[PDB]
Amino acid sequence: MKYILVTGGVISGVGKGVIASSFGTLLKSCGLDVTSIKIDPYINIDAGTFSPYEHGEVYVLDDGAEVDLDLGNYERFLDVTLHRDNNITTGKIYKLVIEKERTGEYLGKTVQVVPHITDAIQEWVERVAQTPVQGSSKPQVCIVELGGTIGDIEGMPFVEAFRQFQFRVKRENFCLAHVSLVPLPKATGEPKTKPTQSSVRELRGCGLSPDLIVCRSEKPIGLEVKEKISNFCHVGPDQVICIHDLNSIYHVPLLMEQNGVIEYLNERLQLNIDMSKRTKCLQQWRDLARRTETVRREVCIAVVGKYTKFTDSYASVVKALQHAALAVNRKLELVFIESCLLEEETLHSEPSKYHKEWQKLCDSHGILVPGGFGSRGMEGKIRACQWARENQKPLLGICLGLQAAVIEFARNKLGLKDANTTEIDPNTANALVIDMPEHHTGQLGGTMRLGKRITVFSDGPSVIRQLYGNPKSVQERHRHRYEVNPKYVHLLEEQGMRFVGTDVDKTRMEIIELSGHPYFVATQYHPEYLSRPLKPSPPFLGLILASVDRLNQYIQRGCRLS
Amino acid sequence: GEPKTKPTQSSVRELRGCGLSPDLIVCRSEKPIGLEVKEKISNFCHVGPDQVICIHDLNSIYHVPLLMEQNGVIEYLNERLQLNIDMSKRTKCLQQWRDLARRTETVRREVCIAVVGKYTKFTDSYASVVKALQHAALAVNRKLELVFIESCLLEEETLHSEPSKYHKEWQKLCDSHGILVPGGFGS
Amino acid sequence: MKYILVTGGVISGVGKGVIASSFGTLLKSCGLDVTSIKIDPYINIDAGTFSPYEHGEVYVLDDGAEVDLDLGNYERFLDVTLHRDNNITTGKIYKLVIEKERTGEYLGKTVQVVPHITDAIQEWVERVAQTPVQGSSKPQVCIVELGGTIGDIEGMPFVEAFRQFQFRVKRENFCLAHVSLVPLPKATGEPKTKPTQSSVRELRGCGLSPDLIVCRSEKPIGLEVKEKISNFCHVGPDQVICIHDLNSIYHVPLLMEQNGVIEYLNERLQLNIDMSKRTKCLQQWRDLARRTETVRREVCIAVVGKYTKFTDSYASVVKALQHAALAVNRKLELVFIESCLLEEETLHSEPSKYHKEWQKLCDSHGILVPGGFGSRGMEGKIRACQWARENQKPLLGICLGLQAAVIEFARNKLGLKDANTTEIDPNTANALVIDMPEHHTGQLGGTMRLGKRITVFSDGPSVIRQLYGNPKSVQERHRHRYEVNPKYVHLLEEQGMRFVGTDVDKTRMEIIELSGHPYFVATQYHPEYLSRPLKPSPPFLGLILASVDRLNQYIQRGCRLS
């Protein structure tokens, strides 16, 4: 079995997830099973005890628990699924060693870091290899990647463990793909290659040998720069690959083919390949770019979030909008609006950025508000949700934001100003949204709704049911813990706020709709995880068509993409 | 593209259809024309070749006396009226018009002035207001940056109708540091 | 005596010369003598055997030989001079060690790197301190800097030697100013600081302790970034200084004053200071910016060089034009034109960039052609020089380019197509420019005209003589080796090409002028070295006034700046 190792480099955040994922989708279409193993050198859990919406997201995509967010790039371009055993953290390894010392496995003697830790990491590699995906036999090439930069203390036991794993097998059963960064300030001009020389020197100071020289830059360099890398890094002249800032994320496989580095992996691993045209399939990557960079209608999409610009807490949101806009020929035009700058305190302080966020939101025709962080910015989303229901503006709530929409409907339409959720102010007389935990078999205390959860529909004629083809039982991931109190839901039966989405026990509300509005759907799950370029998410298609008034003609034809 | 002179020919023909004779040919254009355009006016209007004056869209309003001096039409009025003139430098005073332009088109601090009025753009009901701000900004070296905000687009009825131009007028007003609201029209 | 040490960083070429020079010019006006000591870790000579016009220049500014180009930033903002003992290279140290071992100084025993090489470097520091500038007593604070990055082999003996020098003296008699770079790609957004954390870790892995945290960025950061590095670098919160891409080079002293880091050096070294306004003099740096960023006439200056953009071979040229344009209120507008793309071969190959370089040159009103590199691009400067003499265009030749102008005058005006210099084609019948070396006392073979050389004028009424105040003997640096043959100069006496600049023996021609042309001066020396913000170079003032027709009114008033 082959193994591809992708270590760190100068920077760890420029886009290393799509670089290692390009080699997996290139050999998957040829008839080779490719698996992914994520390594996290952080001491804390990658997503268990991590912050909700701050410096990351709770990446839950077909898994009983939660793993790192970097696993998203290894599933969209491919077609396989992963589990909790693929993501390995330093904190998880420290838990199993204590269980072995108490029972008695190391002959009662003390343990160190070698050969007491380098051998334990190799054991987890064999467990994932012998357990492939549902619908295969045995993987042939694996994609191993790790987080962080190079030279840190947390990354020392990983390099020492991988240096011995290649000696146990043959020479052609292991490779290395080192990714680096080539900075270039605007005040210098000349590509002064110096930080790249220090990154490849530390990797060779452990026992490894770089094979695939990956250098990230910002513009296509000439030929005088590659001649210096061949002698400074002491590698081959054809192993240096030039990578610059691409337009999107699907242009990575289209760049490695022009440089001529695909056939280098065949002569290094000594394997067979049954190609049709040129190496990988050309009837999928080239045809996808012909539906985006051509004719565009320029659709304006304005959403409200926590930060005024793009960051790491909105990574899975900007990627799902690109896969849903290419089907109807649209251009990605998204502006980030901070929810904290929409309250009355911001207007009395700095009114400069107050009306600026409202000017870009009123001109749009689509509202997609995700979730907030605690009670910071909850009053800002109320003023933006009360207008979408009055000016026939489409609105779609992913998660958490639904709790702020049910309270607004009880104040303007009904008239319950005292109604408030128990998370912000539990001391209230109208407990609309309370905390309803789940007590499963074997679990103690108040657990959180996350994992393999199946939801059941309720009503028949619904705009959200016809998108999936009129089913009867759909399974989707969840992460929310607060639910709607089934006591105050009797008042909403006489109004237009209908409940078309329940659970199994018919005691929790997830999908709700409003009568009379052309497009007002508010759900609780996350449709961006169950999306892919081969088949986008149905909920994200109804929001794009509603912004251009092309939704009524999609159901009459029979929904070609359901 | 080509300066097709035809509406001007009908304007100078109606004036000659009463008993008058055009002496000072004033032509308003948008860019400095060459020499082939003035040759047609000398025969179409049946006037002198030196009487045609080229006037284009100026930057302000005080650049009018500085344009007629370069064309050389000041001495034409002296030989037409047969009068005397006691000049010091060149025709008119040069220590006032040339020194005034040296305090405006030089260094500017870019001051943002946003006012609220009746129309969203310049019109005839705000002529004396835009002229008084130019004479007061040249003393402290400032650049004229004025934006018109409609008072009718600042109520609650505009927000419920078309909120596109509602917050746009507030964004340009909050960034400024000066409010000069004139008067409205009725209620 | 105090010593300020400025080590390397992540990158080597962003502008470390203007960073260390800010601390020298700030204490010089207060009444403290500041000296500069340059350390070059390169094995080859910094300018002795270095290439002429390729990856650097021959920096000769008041010195018997040549030193590194990085010493230019330490002399323009200040007012002192340096010698050959300030620049210390690794190749120069290896020459004196062999002489000491052959004679007998190390007791006959072998030598190593400690304590055999660390003590030899400290001896050169005492020799420069005891020999100050001409017109002082003894320096109090020194500025020690070194080239290259951090972590190289050539820089290891320098860090070990400087680590012990601070222990021989007191604690407050030595400091350290570590410079770093904070990259931020345009595809990330968040200031992911990681290469800076690795630069401060390698410096502390020897024995030094950073005191002045200098970080180079591209935009003013907030407050969440400074608090993050203080805990990683384990330094003080007030020691972190934010430096971004400035507009010019004189804005460095104006940035450190706003952050409030000037008084930190007083409490660290325990010295006295007699300030007038606020620390340094405010009647020089603030008044200089009021003559550049105000009213500009937008002058178009187009020159012909070797590269199409700015590089390291034209550093001293772009800095001298800024000091001469602020006196008459002008804006820096310079475009680089490659001389190789001006011949007939470029027109027959790629005519896209051929007429583009001529379009920006004809619209300008000033020609300042420096020197070429060998015989690559000599025919391109001939076509650009034959037009400046016919369309009354100002032309000024720095060096080497004069050889290509004297041949053009002999072909178009005279009629000697066979005339050619001996450097390109020595096999000719009209040896116009030959090689005339100089044989000084004690020197053998053919030497090169470089060092303390004094030139003598010839004619009286000249446009170049009145710029200096009508002298009689001027001293200037030189580097050229080829001279004009005194045999073929008799034909130029009957034409307008007069010789107003000779040497001592009246056998070499340097400054030549043309009769009838309004401004056509061609010299051989370099006026950009003898320039300073307090008094710019006279030759560069006659070229700016000729581009705007403001030169005839400068001599009538009596030349206020001569």
Side-chain angles (χ1 to χ4, degrees):
Chain A
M1 181 180 180
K2 306 302 178 180
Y3 298 93
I4 302 300
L5 179 58
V6 180
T7 60
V10 182
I11 201 61
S12 179
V14 72
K16 59 180 180 300
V18 300
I19 300 300
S21 180
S22 180
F23 300 94
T25 179
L26 189 143
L27 300 180
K28 181 60 180 180
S29 59
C30 300
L32 302 182
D33 301 358
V34 182
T35 178
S36 180
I37 298 180
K38 184 61 180 60
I39 302 299
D40 300 330
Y42 296 155
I43 301 180
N44 199 331
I45 315 181
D46 55 334
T49 60
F50 194 76
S51 58
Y53 295 154
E54 180 68 23
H55 295 171
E57 299 180 1
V58 185
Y59 181 83
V60 181
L61 208 168
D62 188 70
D63 183 68
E66 56 279 350
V67 294
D68 194 6
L69 189 60
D70 299 331
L71 286 76
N73 300 329
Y74 301 93
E75 299 180 0
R76 301 303 179 89
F77 301 96
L78 285 76
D79 53 356
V80 301
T81 178
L82 286 77
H83 300 270
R84 60 180 181 90
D85 299 330
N86 300 89
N87 180 269
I88 300 179
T89 61
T90 58
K92 183 180 180 180
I93 304 300
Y94 295 156
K95 298 179 181 180
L96 54 91
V97 179
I98 306 178
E99 301 179 0
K100 298 178 62 61
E101 297 176 0
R102 182 79 283 180
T103 301
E105 300 292 338
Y106 298 93
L107 301 180
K109 299 181 180 180
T110 180
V111 299
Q112 299 180 1
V113 297
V114 45
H116 302 76
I117 257 59
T118 61
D119 62 330
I121 305 180
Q122 300 179 1
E123 297 181 0
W124 284 88
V125 185
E126 301 292 337
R127 297 185 180 94
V128 185
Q130 65 180 1
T131 59
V133 301
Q134 292 77 9
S136 60
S137 60
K138 181 180 180 180
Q140 290 76 10
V141 48
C142 178
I143 301 299
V144 181
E145 67 284 348
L146 46 83
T149 60
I150 175 180
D152 300 330
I153 297 95
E154 300 175 349
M156 297 180 181
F158 296 151
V159 180
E160 184 69 21
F162 295 154
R163 198 266 302 181
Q164 186 65 19
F165 184 82
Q166 62 178 356
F167 294 155
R168 300 300 180 180
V169 297
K170 210 60 180 60
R171 192 264 300 180
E172 67 278 3
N173 296 337
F174 186 85
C175 180
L176 179 59
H178 180 61
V179 49
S180 59
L181 177 63
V182 183
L184 211 167
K186 59 181 180 180
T188 60
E190 299 292 337
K192 189 64 176 181
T193 301
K194 286 297 175 295
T196 308
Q197 305 176 9
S198 60
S199 60
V200 299
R201 182 179 59 180
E202 185 68 23
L203 181 60
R204 298 179 294 100
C206 299
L208 298 181
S209 180
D211 300 330
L212 300 180
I213 300 300
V214 178
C215 299
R216 180 61 180 270
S217 60
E218 49 86 16
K219 62 179 181 180
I221 60 181
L223 79 166
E224 68 283 349
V225 184
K226 299 181 179 180
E227 298 292 337
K228 299 181 179 181
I229 311 300
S230 300
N231 52 86
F232 290 154
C233 194
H234 301 71
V235 295
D238 53 354
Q239 300 179 359
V240 182
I241 312 177
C242 178
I243 297 92
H244 57 75
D245 297 332
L246 301 177
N247 181 86
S248 180
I249 59 180
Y250 60 93
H251 299 271
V252 184
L254 285 76
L255 184 139
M256 300 180 180
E257 184 179 0
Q258 300 180 0
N259 297 271
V261 299
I262 303 180
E263 66 281 354
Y264 182 82
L265 300 179
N266 298 269
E267 302 181 8
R268 183 60 179 89
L269 303 180
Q270 282 72 22
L271 298 179
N272 300 120
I273 171 180
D274 196 333
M275 61 181 61
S276 60
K277 299 300 180 180
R278 296 182 179 181
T279 69
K280 60 180 180 60
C281 180
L282 300 179
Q283 291 77 9
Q284 181 179 359
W285 299 92
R286 297 182 179 181
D287 300 332
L288 183 61
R290 298 180 179 271
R291 300 177 180 267
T292 301
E293 301 180 4
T294 58
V295 47
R296 294 88 60 180
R297 273 70 182 270
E298 300 181 0
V299 52
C300 181
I301 300 300
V303 304
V304 45
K306 185 178 181 179
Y307 297 91
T308 59
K309 59 181 179 61
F310 57 93
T311 174
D312 53 356
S313 61
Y314 297 95
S316 60
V317 182
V318 299
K319 297 182 300 180
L321 300 180
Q322 301 179 3
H323 299 170
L326 42 78
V328 295
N329 300 120
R330 294 299 180 271
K331 184 180 61 60
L332 180 61
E333 182 180 0
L334 184 61
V335 49
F336 299 91
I337 282 81
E338 179 174 359
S339 60
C340 300
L341 269 57
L342 302 180
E343 301 180 1
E344 59 180 359
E345 184 180 2
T346 305
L347 178 60
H348 296 353
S349 61
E350 300 180 0
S352 56
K353 281 80 61 180
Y354 181 82
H355 300 78
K356 182 180 180 180
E357 299 179 354
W358 286 90
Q359 187 272 347
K360 300 180 180 180
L361 180 60
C362 62
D363 299 333
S364 180
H365 301 269
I367 286 83
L368 182 60
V369 40
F373 181 81
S375 300
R376 180 180 180 270
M378 299 295 101
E379 292 77 11
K381 300 180 179 181
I382 302 180
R383 301 180 181 270
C385 183
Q386 61 180 0
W387 177 253
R389 60 179 300 270
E390 299 179 1
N391 199 19
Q392 60 181 359
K393 295 300 181 60
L395 186 143
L396 181 59
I398 303 180
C399 62
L400 183 56
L402 192 148
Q403 303 178 5
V406 64
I407 302 179
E408 181 272 341
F409 188 82
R411 296 180 180 179
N412 300 330
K413 183 60 180 179
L414 301 180
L416 300 181
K417 301 298 180 179
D418 191 70
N420 185 87
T421 179
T422 59
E423 180 180 0
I424 301 179
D425 189 9
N427 300 119
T428 180
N430 299 270
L432 182 60
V433 180
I434 61 179
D435 180 70
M436 182 180 300
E438 301 183 4
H439 299 68
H440 300 270
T441 60
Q443 300 292 338
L444 76 165
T447 60
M448 182 178 60
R449 180 180 180 90
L450 190 148
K452 301 299 181 179
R453 307 304 175 91
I454 304 179
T455 59
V456 184
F457 296 92
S458 301
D459 297 68
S462 181
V463 70
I464 191 61
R465 183 178 181 178
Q466 278 65 269
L467 297 180
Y468 295 89
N470 300 89
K472 60 180 180 180
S473 181
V474 62
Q475 185 178 8
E476 195 76 8
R477 305 289 85 89
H478 296 275
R479 68 178 63 179
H480 54 73
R481 58 177 65 259
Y482 299 94
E483 300 292 339
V484 184
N485 197 329
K487 183 179 180 180
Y488 298 92
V489 300
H490 182 269
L491 183 59
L492 289 315
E493 300 180 0
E494 292 77 11
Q495 301 293 340
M497 181 61 60
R498 59 181 179 181
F499 303 97
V500 301
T502 57
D503 58 329
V504 181
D505 300 329
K506 300 180 180 179
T507 57
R508 301 176 181 88
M509 301 303 176
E510 292 78 7
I511 298 93
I512 58 179
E513 296 181 1
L514 180 61
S515 300
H517 199 273
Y519 185 85
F520 187 85
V521 181
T523 178
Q524 288 285 353
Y525 54 79
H526 301 68
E528 62 274 11
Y529 289 88
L530 271 302
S531 180
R532 58 180 179 270
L534 286 77
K535 180 180 180 180
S537 59
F540 286 164
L541 264 58
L543 183 61
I544 302 300
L545 298 179
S547 179
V548 295
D549 300 330
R550 296 179 61 91
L551 183 60
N552 300 330
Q553 60 180 359
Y554 184 81
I555 312 180
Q556 301 180 0
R557 57 171 55 93
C559 299
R560 60 179 180 180
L561 209 171
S562 180
Chain B
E2 300 292 338
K4 191 64 176 180
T5 301
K6 287 298 176 296
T8 308
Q9 305 178 11
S10 60
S11 60
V12 299
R13 183 180 60 180
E14 185 68 22
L15 181 61
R16 298 179 294 100
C18 297
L20 299 180
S21 179
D23 301 331
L24 300 180
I25 301 300
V26 178
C27 299
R28 180 60 180 269
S29 60
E30 50 87 15
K31 62 179 181 180
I33 60 181
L35 78 166
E36 68 283 350
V37 184
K38 299 181 180 180
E39 298 292 337
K40 299 181 180 180
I41 310 299
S42 300
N43 53 87
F44 290 153
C45 193
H46 302 73
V47 295
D50 54 354
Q51 300 179 359
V52 180
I53 312 176
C54 178
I55 296 92
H56 56 75
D57 298 331
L58 301 178
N59 180 84
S60 181
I61 59 179
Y62 59 92
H63 299 271
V64 183
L66 286 77
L67 185 140
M68 300 180 180
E69 184 179 0
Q70 300 180 359
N71 297 270
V73 298
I74 303 180
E75 66 281 353
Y76 182 82
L77 300 180
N78 298 270
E79 302 182 8
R80 183 60 179 89
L81 303 180
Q82 282 72 23
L83 299 179
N84 300 120
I85 171 181
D86 196 332
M87 61 181 61
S88 60
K89 299 300 180 180
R90 296 182 179 181
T91 69
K92 59 180 179 60
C93 180
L94 300 180
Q95 291 76 9
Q96 181 180 359
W97 298 92
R98 297 182 179 181
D99 300 331
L100 183 61
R102 298 180 179 271
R103 300 177 180 267
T104 301
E105 301 180 3
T106 58
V107 47
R108 294 88 60 180
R109 273 70 182 270
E110 300 180 0
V111 52
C112 181
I113 299 300
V115 304
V116 45
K118 186 178 181 179
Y119 297 91
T120 60
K121 59 180 179 60
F122 57 93
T123 174
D124 53 355
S125 60
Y126 297 95
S128 60
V129 182
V130 299
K131 298 182 300 180
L133 300 180
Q134 300 179 2
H135 299 169
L138 41 78
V140 296
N141 300 120
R142 293 299 180 271
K143 184 179 61 60
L144 179 61
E145 182 180 0
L146 185 61
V147 50
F148 299 92
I149 282 81
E150 179 174 358
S151 60
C152 300
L153 269 57
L154 302 180
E155 301 181 1
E156 59 180 359
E157 184 180 2
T158 305
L159 178 60
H160 295 353
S161 61
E162 300 180 359
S164 56
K165 281 80 61 180
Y166 181 82
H167 300 79
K168 182 180 179 181
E169 299 179 352
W170 288 90
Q171 187 272 347
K172 300 181 180 180
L173 182 61
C174 62
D175 298 332
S176 180
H177 300 269
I179 286 83
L180 182 60
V181 41
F185 181 81
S187 300
Chain C
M1 181 180 180
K2 306 302 178 180
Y3 298 94
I4 302 300
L5 179 58
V6 179
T7 59
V10 183
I11 201 61
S12 179
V14 68
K16 300 181 301 300
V18 300
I19 300 300
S21 180
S22 180
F23 301 94
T25 179
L26 190 143
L27 299 180
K28 181 60 180 180
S29 59
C30 300
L32 302 182
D33 300 358
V34 182
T35 178
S36 180
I37 298 180
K38 184 61 181 61
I39 303 300
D40 300 331
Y42 296 155
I43 301 180
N44 198 331
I45 314 180
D46 54 335
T49 61
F50 194 76
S51 59
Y53 295 153
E54 181 68 23
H55 295 171
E57 299 180 1
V58 185
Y59 181 83
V60 181
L61 208 168
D62 187 70
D63 182 68
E66 56 278 347
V67 294
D68 194 5
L69 189 60
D70 299 331
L71 286 76
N73 299 329
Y74 301 93
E75 300 181 1
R76 301 301 179 90
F77 301 94
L78 285 77
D79 53 354
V80 301
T81 179
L82 286 77
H83 300 269
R84 61 180 180 91
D85 300 330
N86 301 90
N87 180 270
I88 300 179
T89 62
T90 58
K92 183 180 180 180
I93 303 300
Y94 295 156
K95 298 180 180 180
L96 50 88
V97 177
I98 306 179
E99 300 179 0
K100 297 177 62 61
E101 298 176 0
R102 181 78 283 180
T103 302
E105 299 290 341
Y106 298 93
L107 301 178
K109 299 181 180 180
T110 180
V111 299
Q112 299 180 1
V113 298
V114 45
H116 300 78
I117 230 62
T118 60
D119 62 330
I121 306 181
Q122 301 179 1
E123 296 180 0
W124 279 88
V125 186
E126 301 292 337
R127 297 185 180 93
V128 185
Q130 65 180 0
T131 60
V133 301
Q134 292 76 9
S136 60
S137 61
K138 180 179 182 179
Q140 291 76 10
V141 48
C142 178
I143 301 299
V144 181
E145 67 284 348
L146 47 86
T149 60
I150 173 180
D152 300 331
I153 295 94
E154 300 174 349
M156 296 181 181
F158 296 151
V159 180
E160 183 69 21
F162 294 155
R163 197 266 304 180
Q164 186 65 20
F165 183 82
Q166 62 179 356
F167 294 155
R168 300 300 180 180
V169 297
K170 209 60 181 61
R171 192 265 300 181
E172 66 277 4
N173 295 337
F174 186 85
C175 180
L176 178 59
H178 180 60
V179 60
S180 60
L181 178 64
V182 182
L184 206 164
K186 60 180 180 180
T188 60
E190 299 291 338
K192 191 64 176 180
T193 302
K194 285 297 174 296
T196 306
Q197 304 178 9
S198 60
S199 60
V200 299
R201 182 179 60 180
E202 185 68 23
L203 182 60
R204 298 179 295 100
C206 299
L208 298 181
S209 181
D211 300 330
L212 300 179
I213 300 300
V214 179
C215 299
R216 180 60 180 269
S217 60
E218 50 86 17
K219 61 179 180 180
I221 60 181
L223 79 166
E224 70 284 348
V225 185
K226 299 180 180 180
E227 300 291 340
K228 184 179 180 180
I229 314 299
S230 300
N231 55 89
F232 290 153
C233 194
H234 299 70
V235 295
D238 53 354
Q239 300 180 0
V240 180
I241 311 177
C242 178
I243 297 93
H244 56 75
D245 298 332
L246 301 178
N247 180 85
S248 181
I249 59 179
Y250 60 92
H251 299 271
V252 184
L254 285 76
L255 184 139
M256 300 180 180
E257 184 179 359
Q258 300 180 0
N259 298 271
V261 299
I262 303 180
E263 67 280 355
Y264 182 82
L265 300 179
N266 298 269
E267 302 180 8
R268 183 61 179 89
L269 302 180
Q270 282 73 21
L271 297 179
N272 300 120
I273 171 180
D274 196 333
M275 60 181 61
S276 60
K277 299 300 180 180
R278 296 182 179 181
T279 69
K280 60 180 180 60
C281 180
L282 300 179
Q283 291 77 9
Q284 181 179 359
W285 299 92
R286 297 182 179 181
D287 300 332
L288 183 61
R290 298 180 179 271
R291 300 177 180 267
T292 301
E293 301 180 4
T294 58
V295 47
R296 294 88 60 180
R297 273 70 182 270
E298 300 181 0
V299 52
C300 181
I301 299 300
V303 303
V304 46
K306 186 179 181 180
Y307 297 91
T308 60
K309 59 180 179 60
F310 57 93
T311 175
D312 53 355
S313 60
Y314 297 95
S316 61
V317 183
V318 299
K319 297 182 301 180
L321 299 180
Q322 301 179 2
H323 299 170
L326 41 78
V328 296
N329 300 120
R330 293 299 179 271
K331 184 180 61 60
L332 180 61
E333 182 180 0
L334 185 61
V335 49
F336 299 92
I337 281 81
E338 180 174 0
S339 60
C340 300
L341 271 59
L342 301 180
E343 301 181 1
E344 59 180 359
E345 184 179 2
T346 305
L347 179 60
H348 296 353
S349 61
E350 300 180 0
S352 56
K353 282 80 61 180
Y354 181 83
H355 299 78
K356 181 181 180 180
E357 299 178 354
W358 282 89
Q359 181 180 0
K360 301 179 181 180
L361 182 60
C362 60
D363 298 358
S364 179
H365 301 269
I367 286 83
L368 182 60
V369 41
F373 181 81
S375 300
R376 180 180 180 270
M378 298 296 101
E379 292 77 11
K381 300 180 180 180
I382 303 180
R383 301 179 181 270
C385 183
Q386 61 180 0
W387 176 253
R389 60 179 300 270
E390 300 179 0
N391 200 20
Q392 60 180 0
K393 295 300 180 60
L395 186 143
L396 181 59
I398 303 179
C399 61
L400 184 56
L402 191 147
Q403 303 178 6
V406 64
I407 302 180
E408 182 272 341
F409 187 82
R411 296 180 180 179
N412 300 330
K413 183 60 180 179
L414 301 180
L416 300 180
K417 301 298 180 179
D418 192 70
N420 185 87
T421 179
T422 60
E423 180 180 0
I424 301 179
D425 189 9
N427 300 119
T428 180
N430 299 270
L432 182 60
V433 180
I434 61 179
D435 180 70
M436 183 180 300
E438 301 182 3
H439 298 68
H440 300 270
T441 60
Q443 300 292 339
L444 76 165
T447 60
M448 182 178 59
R449 180 180 180 90
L450 190 147
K452 301 299 181 179
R453 307 304 174 91
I454 304 180
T455 59
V456 184
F457 296 92
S458 300
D459 297 68
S462 181
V463 70
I464 191 61
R465 183 178 181 178
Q466 279 65 269
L467 297 180
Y468 295 90
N470 300 89
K472 60 180 180 180
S473 181
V474 62
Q475 185 178 9
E476 197 76 7
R477 305 289 84 90
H478 297 275
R479 68 179 64 179
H480 54 73
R481 58 177 65 259
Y482 298 94
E483 301 292 339
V484 184
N485 197 329
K487 183 179 180 180
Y488 298 92
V489 300
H490 182 269
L491 183 59
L492 289 315
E493 300 180 1
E494 292 77 11
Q495 301 293 340
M497 181 61 60
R498 59 181 179 180
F499 303 98
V500 301
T502 57
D503 59 329
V504 181
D505 300 329
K506 300 180 180 179
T507 56
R508 301 176 181 88
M509 301 303 176
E510 292 78 8
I511 298 93
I512 58 180
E513 296 181 1
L514 180 61
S515 300
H517 199 274
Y519 185 86
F520 187 85
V521 181
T523 178
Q524 289 286 352
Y525 55 80
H526 301 68
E528 62 274 11
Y529 289 88
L530 272 302
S531 180
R532 58 180 179 270
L534 286 77
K535 180 180 180 180
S537 59
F540 287 164
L541 264 58
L543 183 61
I544 301 300
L545 298 179
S547 178
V548 295
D549 300 330
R550 296 179 61 91
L551 183 60
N552 300 330
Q553 59 180 359
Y554 184 81
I555 312 180
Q556 301 180 0
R557 57 171 55 93
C559 300
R560 60 179 180 180
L561 209 171
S562 180

